[PDB]
């Protein structure tokens, strides 16, 4: 029962292959559901359940918000280049925001801005205030918090409008988002010298959370286990690996343990 709505905006001064001038991607529970960029100038669905529940006026409505924000972010790039006294070139303005709906029905808000790869303004939940990273950011903090109402409008959006959208979205995507797919697990031997490396690979699982560990006669070997980060497949499932080096004559003692929402009991897998 955790749920999230998130928007990621990336605006560059220097478009490049695969990098339009402005891109806005929306995500529900970590899965893309809407996409906009400055080259198409339209918002496209990225999953079937949003295309089936939204009419034309929804797509027109979010599209004109993205087109307008695109326009504002082109001005931001000029403003910030001059403010930091930079030369024309490669520059990136980024915004990530949205809301979480937690187990206990409490909510959380995210609102953070980056410029040229560094923190610019970060909303701090305890201070109820944007943290400026530098004197450049302080100017914008003043514009938003003191010289106008923007900071309060964002607060309202994050705590109300965003949640209302999230509730709608989870109800249209309930089947896709709460599905389960089992990993195909294989333990492989990798090449090494005087040492036997075992590699446990779990393919195609959903949802994302997983525990993959190595046991020796039933005992976790956390100290000796290296594990990669969880990474996506093209179909919305995930992938992870974990390796351990062992004494060749101990081969029979090791099992890979996979605990996952799709598996009634944790699976044990052997070379």
């Amino acid at each position: 029962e955790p749920h999230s709505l998130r928007y990621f905006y990336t605006a560059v001064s220097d478009p490049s292959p695969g990098v339009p001038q402005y891109v806005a991607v929306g995500y529900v529970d970590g899965e893309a559901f809407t996409y906009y960029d400055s080259e198409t100038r339209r918002t496209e669905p990225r999953v079937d359940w949003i295309a089936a529940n939204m009419d034309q006026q929804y797509w027109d409505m979010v599209t004109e918000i993205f087109q307008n924000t695109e326009q504002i972010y082109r001005i931001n790039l000029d403003t910030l280049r001059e403010r930091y006294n930079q030369s024309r070139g490669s520059h990136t303005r980024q915004w990530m925001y949205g809301c979480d709906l937690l187990e206990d029905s409490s909510i959380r808000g995210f609102d953070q801005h980056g410029y040229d790869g560094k923190d610019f303004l970060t909303f701090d939940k305890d201070a109820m205030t944007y943290t400026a990273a530098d004197a450049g950011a302080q100017i914008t903090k003043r514009k938003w918090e003191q010289e106008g109402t923007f900071a309060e409008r964002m607060k309202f959006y994050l705590e109300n409008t965003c949640i209302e959208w999230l509730r709608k979205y989870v109800s249209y995507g309930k089947d896709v988002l709460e599905r389960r797919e089992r990993p195909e697990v294989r333990v492989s031997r990798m090449e090494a010298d005087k040492i036997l490396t075992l590699s446990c690979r779990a393919h195609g699982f959903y949802p994302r959370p997983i525990s993959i560990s190595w046991l020796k006669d039933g005992m976790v070997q956390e100290q000796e286990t290296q594990r990669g980060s969880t990474v996506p497949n093209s179909d919305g499932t995930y992938h992870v690996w974990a390796t351990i080096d062992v004494l060749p004559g101990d081969w029979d003692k090791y099992q890979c343990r996979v605990e996952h929402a799709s598996l009634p009991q944790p699976g044990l897998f052997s070379w």
């Binding site: 918000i65 924000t69 504002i72 403003t79 925001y97 938003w144 923007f150 965003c162």
Partner: peptide
């Protein structure tokens, strides 16, 4: 649905 009325930096 995204936030609207975005203010300039």
């Amino acid at each position: 649905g995204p936030a609207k009325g975005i203010e300039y930096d």
